[PDB]
Amino acid sequence: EEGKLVIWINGDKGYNGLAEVGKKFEKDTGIKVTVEHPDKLEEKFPQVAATGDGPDIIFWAHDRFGGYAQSGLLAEITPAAAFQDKLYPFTWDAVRYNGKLIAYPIAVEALSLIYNKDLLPNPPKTWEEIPALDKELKAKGKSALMFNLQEPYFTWPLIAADGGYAFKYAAGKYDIKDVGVDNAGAKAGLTFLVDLIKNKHMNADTDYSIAEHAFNHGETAMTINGPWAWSNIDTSAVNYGVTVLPTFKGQPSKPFVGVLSAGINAASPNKELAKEFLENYLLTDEGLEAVNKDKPLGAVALKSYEEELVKDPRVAATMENAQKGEIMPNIPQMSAFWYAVRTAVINAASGRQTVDAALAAAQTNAAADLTLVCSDDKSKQATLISYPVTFKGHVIKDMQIFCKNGWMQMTRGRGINMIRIHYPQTYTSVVPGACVFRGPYSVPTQDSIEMYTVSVALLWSDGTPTYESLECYVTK
Ligand SMILES: OC[C@H]1O[C@H](O[C@H]2[C@H](O)[C@@H](O)[C@@H](O)O[C@@H]2CO)[C@H](O)[C@@H](O)[C@@H]1O
Numbered sequence: 001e002e003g004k005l006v007i008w009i010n011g012d013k014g015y016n017g018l019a020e021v022g023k024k025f026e027k028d029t030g031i032k033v034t035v036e037h038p039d040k041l042e043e044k045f046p047q048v049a050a051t052g053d054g055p056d057i058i059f060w061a062h063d064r065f066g067g068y069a070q071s072g073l074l075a076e077i078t079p080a081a082a083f084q085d086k087l088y089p090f091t092w093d094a095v096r097y098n099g100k101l102i103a104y105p106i107a108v109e110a111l112s113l114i115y116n117k118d119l120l121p122n123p124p125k126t127w128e129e130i131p132a133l134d135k136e137l138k139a140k141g142k143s144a145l146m147f148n149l150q151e152p153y154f155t156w157p158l159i160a161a162d163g164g165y166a167f168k169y170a171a172g173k174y175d176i177k178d179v180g181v182d183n184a185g186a187k188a189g190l191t192f193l194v195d196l197i198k199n200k201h202m203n204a205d206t207d208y209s210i211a212e213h214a215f216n217h218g219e220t221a222m223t224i225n226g227p228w229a230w231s232n233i234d235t236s237a238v239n240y241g242v243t244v245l246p247t248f249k250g251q252p253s254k255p256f257v258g259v260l261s262a263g264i265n266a267a268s269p270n271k272e273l274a275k276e277f278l279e280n281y282l283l284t285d286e287g288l289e290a291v292n293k294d295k296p297l298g299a300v301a302l303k304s305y306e307e308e309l310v311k312d313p314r315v316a317a318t319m320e321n322a323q324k325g326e327i328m329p330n331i332p333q334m335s336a337f338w339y340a341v342r343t344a345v346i347n348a349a350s351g352r353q354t355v356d357a358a359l360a361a362a363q364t365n366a367a368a369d370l371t372l373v374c375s376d377d378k379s380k381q382a383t384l385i386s387y388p389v390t391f392k393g394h395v396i397k398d399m400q401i402f403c404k405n406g407w408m409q410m411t412r413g414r415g416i417n418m419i420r421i422h423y424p425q426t427y428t429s430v431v432p433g434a435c436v437f438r439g440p441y442s443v444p445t446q447d448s449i450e451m452y453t454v455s456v457a458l459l460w461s462d463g464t465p466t467y468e469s470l471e472c473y474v475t476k
Helices: 016-028 040-048 062-070 081-085 091-095 126-140 152-161 184-198 208-216 227-235 273-280 285-294 304-308 313-325 334-350 355-368
Strands: 004-006 033-036 055-060 104-109 111-116 143-147 166-171 173-180 220-227 240-243 256-264 370-373 382-386 397-405 406-409 419-422 438-443 451-459 463-475
Touching: 004 016, 004 273, 016 033, 016 273, 033 166, 040 062, 055 126, 055 273, 062 081, 062 334, 062 406, 091 104, 091 463, 104 273, 111 313, 126 143, 126 184, 126 220, 126 256, 152 184, 152 220, 152 256, 152 334, 152 438, 166 334, 173 355, 184 334, 184 355, 208 227, 220 227, 220 419, 227 313, 240 313, 256 273, 273 285, 285 304, 334 355, 355 370, 355 463, 438 463
Parallel strands: 004 033, 004 055, 143 220
Antiparallel strands: 055 256, 104 256, 111 220, 111 240, 166 173, 370 382, 382 419, 397 406, 397 451, 438 451, 451 463
């Protein structure tokens, strides 16, 4: 709707403060500003913006914006040099996609270790110490650590500590072909997490609100969270510190660093109003103050403000953790990475898959966009799903699936491609066209399980071949 600004931002952010900024905007321009916090908005935005609908402005960490830009959902930003100089350059670099500025950077985000000083004056420096510490607190009616296990954002710092990575950065770009989900380091880290759960130091079902409640009411000595979380702790009775994440196998935990960013919907008729709102209301000492006061932003992108923020030790700790991590890629393939790791962590933590199997499925999903939906019952068939998210640059051109009975080609277009995979011995005769698992194979680790597998050959646009396999496991 023209003559009005609609803003979407995550419900864990400073939306009331931004609303107050919006009030400051309406009052001067007569233009009403409505701030909303849709659920799973990072998914809902590309859905509705694609229909020409949605907000004028969308706020999210920069990693999602490359996908948005590739789908044509974001207007190009062209700020003056003067405005550009007001913000730190690396924050601008975070919002650049295939050459163009696709958003306004706002603040730099990283997870930190947050601890209750009255329970735990000297918090552990290593993950390895948490079990012994938990045993001591449990006797006192408390627990050592609770944090959100449902979102891979929070568990990634540990998985990445021993060598896990999303995409390798080489020769001036992310190498979409070199995916780090499945390696020895990632396995060691996720195994440590799963072991914390097996040993009842953490609970697989723990989510954001459970961990927030447990920490802010004094039940658990530590939590892992970002700056947005500090204001609720300020309200609580907890005297807290914000410090460096614990090390794992002697290496720093490596949080993925986000830059909170504001994109303008390409379909918005209101773009000039959105630009002026963002530049002359939101990014100002006053506006950033308003939002930061409602819920802290971390290290803001605005130079004038940063100088006052660097004095807040919580922000300093934030930047200390950021320096030990890595800025998130913004490439479209990140959406497949995050989906794949979310599934792996949830499945490993619950005990539905082993760490090795979970990561192996995650690796293939993040790298090749292939998901295999297994059935516990052999008589019900598996489904292989191909769902490409990257349409530009180095991409898989050709895909061949190796099934027990031969090779079959599978195309990559924008859309979704699904085939059934049959377990062998299931059909009384050979079914024309059907892809059949190789197996059953033994699994040395677990004696009660049978493995089935198919293989895949990938031909990249540059001629590079690569190979994947996908497994399903079944109880005998
Ligand atoms: O969990 C995967 C998720 O991680 C990041 O989302 C963060 C976000 O950056 C923070 O600002 C805060 O809101 O917490 C989110 C996790 O709940 C990625 O930005 C996102 O794309 C990804 O799906």
